Design a protein around this ligand. Sequence first.
Ligand SMILES: *[C@@H]1O[C@H](CO)[C@@H](O[C@@H]2O[C@H](CO)[C@@H](O[C@@H]3O[C@H](CO[C@@H]4O[C@H](CO)[C@@H](O)[C@H](O)[C@@H]4O)[C@@H](O)[C@H](O[C@@H]4O[C@H](CO)[C@@H](O)[C@H](O)[C@@H]4O)[C@@H]3O)[C@H](O)[C@H]2NC(C)=O)[C@H](O)[C@H]1NC(C)=O
Ligand SMILES: [Ca+2]
Lengths: 179, 640, 193
Amino acid sequence: KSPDVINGSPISQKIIYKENERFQYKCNMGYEYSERGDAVCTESGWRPLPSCEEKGKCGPPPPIDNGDITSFPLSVYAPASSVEYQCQNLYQLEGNKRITCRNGQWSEPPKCLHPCVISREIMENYNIALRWTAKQKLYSRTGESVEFVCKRGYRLSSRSHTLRTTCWDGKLEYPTCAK
Amino acid sequence: SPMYSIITPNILRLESEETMVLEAHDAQGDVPVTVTVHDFPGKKLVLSSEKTVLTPATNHMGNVTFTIPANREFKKGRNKFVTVQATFGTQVVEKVVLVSLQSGYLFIQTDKTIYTPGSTVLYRIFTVNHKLLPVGRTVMVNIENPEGIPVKQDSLSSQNQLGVLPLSWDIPELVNMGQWKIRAYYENSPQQVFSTEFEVKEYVLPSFEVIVEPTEKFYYIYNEKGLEVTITARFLYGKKVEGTAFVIFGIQDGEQRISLPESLKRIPIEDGSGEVVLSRKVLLDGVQNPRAEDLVGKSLYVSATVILHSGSDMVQAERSGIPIVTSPYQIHFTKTPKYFKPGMPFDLMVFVTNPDGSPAYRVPVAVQGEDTVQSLTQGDGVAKLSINTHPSQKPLSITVRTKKQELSEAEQATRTMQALPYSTVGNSNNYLHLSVLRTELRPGETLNVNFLLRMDRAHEAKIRYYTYLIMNKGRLLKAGRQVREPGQDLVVLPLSITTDFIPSFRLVAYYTLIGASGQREVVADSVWVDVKDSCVGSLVVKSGQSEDRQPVPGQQMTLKIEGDHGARVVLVAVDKGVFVLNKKNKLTQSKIWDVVEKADIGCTPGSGKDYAGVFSDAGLTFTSSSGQQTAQRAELQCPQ
Amino acid sequence: GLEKRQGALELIKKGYTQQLAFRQPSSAFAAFVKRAPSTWLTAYVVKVFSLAVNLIAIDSQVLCGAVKWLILEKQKPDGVFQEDAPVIHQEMIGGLRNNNEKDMALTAFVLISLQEAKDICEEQVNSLPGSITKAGDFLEANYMNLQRSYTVAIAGYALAQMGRLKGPLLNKFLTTAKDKNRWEDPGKQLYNV
Ligand SMILES: *[C@@H]1O[C@H](CO)[C@@H](O[C@@H]2O[C@H](CO)[C@@H](O[C@@H]3O[C@H](CO[C@@H]4O[C@H](CO)[C@@H](O)[C@H](O)[C@@H]4O)[C@@H](O)[C@H](O[C@@H]4O[C@H](CO)[C@@H](O)[C@H](O)[C@@H]4O)[C@@H]3O)[C@H](O)[C@H]2NC(C)=O)[C@H](O)[C@H]1NC(C)=O
Ligand SMILES: [Ca+2]
């Protein structure tokens, strides 16, 4: 079961623990950990006894895709509390970054926009090179404007998309050069 | 300025009650103390956790009694340790203590010593703890053939059996002769294996006993009279024996026996007694060495065969291990401390024995150069020699000789020992000496413990009390304080000796102060005191009837058994013919106390090279908050 | 010596406390408070601290915060870690020094540091498993194009913790060991150990 640490409050929100699961806890003001600061569930019970020595509310915020909150998650949030989100690198956040707890429910969370591939097989099948010198890299964040040109001997076709294209959530319009 | 100190036995045993004494010297008010014992090094479980308070009414001295369960957590294999953590207020004092796997003691008693193929072996296993008190545990028993292969295992319980476990094992008709063994061990301690042997052989009772008894317990190599031996033959019911005896002698060298055919004699056994002399000439002619000095160190054995005139019974008996010596005695310093206090009286426990190892009674002993210091051995062959040491750092070398009058100087026994100066803290020359009159001490008396102090007078008034501890059977029996007034050099402690001191106890006392360069100093001293080996209670079996009434085959008899109230007594009646054939592995009281003393954690007669050596050598671990502590002990066995 | 372990513990506590002074507000780590946070150094602090939770009191917010940092910042969409502020001591990284297959090696290192702190930082960081999976995807795809024994070794252990080291990948892990007992490559011997 979830141990009742004296002069302290748990960090993890889980109540039932299987074997070898760790139980994180922190000590209250004026106290600190004694030896081990966590507890492990073994057959005879918790091996490290959680001890501390002398020196309408909402639930957890909803998880998003390719992102996470900036603070540390809590089991219960007091009313009028607010957390913020942030996407991974080269991802673009779309929507309200901050959500607020009101009357046991959160506000609408944002999403994360997917960047694009600059595929090497597509570049060779369309006969285009980056034209800003590079080995690779410089990859299309959602909203970034890439550019290419044709190879030496090809030209843009009649209805080929512009050489300067912008990626939008995992979709990229590659130019094409024929003849 | 305040110093917190803990003392715990050198080695901690499982399922045994262990005491811990807590002191807060130079402190005021109440000191909350919480003692926790954890495993080493992981601290997965809290093996014990007790609390106490050190109040000024108790002179800031308390104890914590705890029993460590034999948890399934401990793993031949590596040695196991525990962390002892004492918390006084803010301060915490920890010590890493060695753990012994011995759970307690197991004693095996077989009804007989030798058995015929087909018979049943009846044996009882007594299951006690380190206090010899009956306990209820699970015991593993292994029956082992002379070859060594275990042939029958079992796992039984001692619960509701009052510490006595009655078992039996049937011997097959077709069986291998020789020395069989029973091997038992507690379930919790598979490393502590107790054993007893019993011979299996085809035999018949001899109906009488033959006794080969030499005049002396040895043979002086320059005695022209030779070894005179008296043969005493008597029936198992008392009456003497008339017959004829064939006696023959031999020389034993280690394990090589050389019979002397020329020494063979046929003598009449008249009135149950006969005499036969091995002449010195035959002895020298028998061995192929003219130099008699080479026979010294070897032994003689005598074999006698007595045949009744009726020719219906014959008994062969032997008496071996008769050392050929040049001195009737042998001096040992195995009971005398090997550390002295310069300037204070140094006590020596001389141990004079006969060539066969038995104690020697009334033997004059003295120190070379000090004819005044001449003492007499007691009934246990232990004499006390007190000398006066000069204040010095020179190794005190003692040579003790026997001064038995009427014995020439060439035959007097001699032995040489050496003692080292008790090194003090910062060469402060602060010494403590505990002395006790060496004499057979018995339960129910009182021993005066003399605390004698020697130190400079500049800090003698600060010493207001001594801390004394008693070690018995490998556990702390009693701890207390001894009030000492400024100016008094010697104070007397009336120590009441009860049955809890059997067979022996160590008294280690120490005092602490702040001296010299404002350094915290501890000075200690210990002494070993022997007690008259006996039972804790009593058990006597005597005749419960009139001694005009003679025992007759089949006749009812009354047996008077007088012992402790509520005790469960187990009995056995054995024919003395059995003991005429084999008298080994017999359960006595002396053997029980022998086993107990061999599982002792002390390794010295007394004292040590420093204040930590006194505690370590007396089986104790001292650890103060200021940092003064004893070195670690990682050896279950004492140092050689 | 049983008594020495206490002082040995004191040093670890001391070191941990001393390392807290360089924890940037982003729950990252760098040689100096003003210096830009290093990817490899933050991952290495996770490593040591994850193996030390059984010895002294390690705060979960510190360890788990560093993990959440590496995932949201130093993680590319393909899934591979990039060190944006190289450590000043290039001799404390071992085999990643001057390594050409830096992407594969650095990915394996940071990933292993994540999987060692999984059981500890699974409640607070909710994005941990997906990132472990993302790192694992890149290592699996370009594992066979390895050449350096070191990279094959470190990526093999990074994949064995997931059970994703089978087939031709497992074959390459076993055949790169010369004499069937060592993963050796021309250069410093410390890299081969
Ligand atoms: C650890 O520390 C404890 C502290 O209590 C020590 O226990 C002392 O041990 C004494 C052994 O010598 C015991 O004294 C005995 O007490 C008998 C009374 O029995 C008590 O019954 C109560 C039940 O209410 C129990 O709780 C107690 O534990 C006792 O069993 C007395 O008949 C008898 O004598 C007394 O002490 C002196 C002796 O000179 C008399 O002057 C006094 O008037 C009184 O009659 C007997 O000696 C007792 O358990 C206890 N005594 C005291 C004073 O605390 C442990 O011995 C310590 N253990 C170690 C290893 O150091
Ligand atoms: Ca004795």
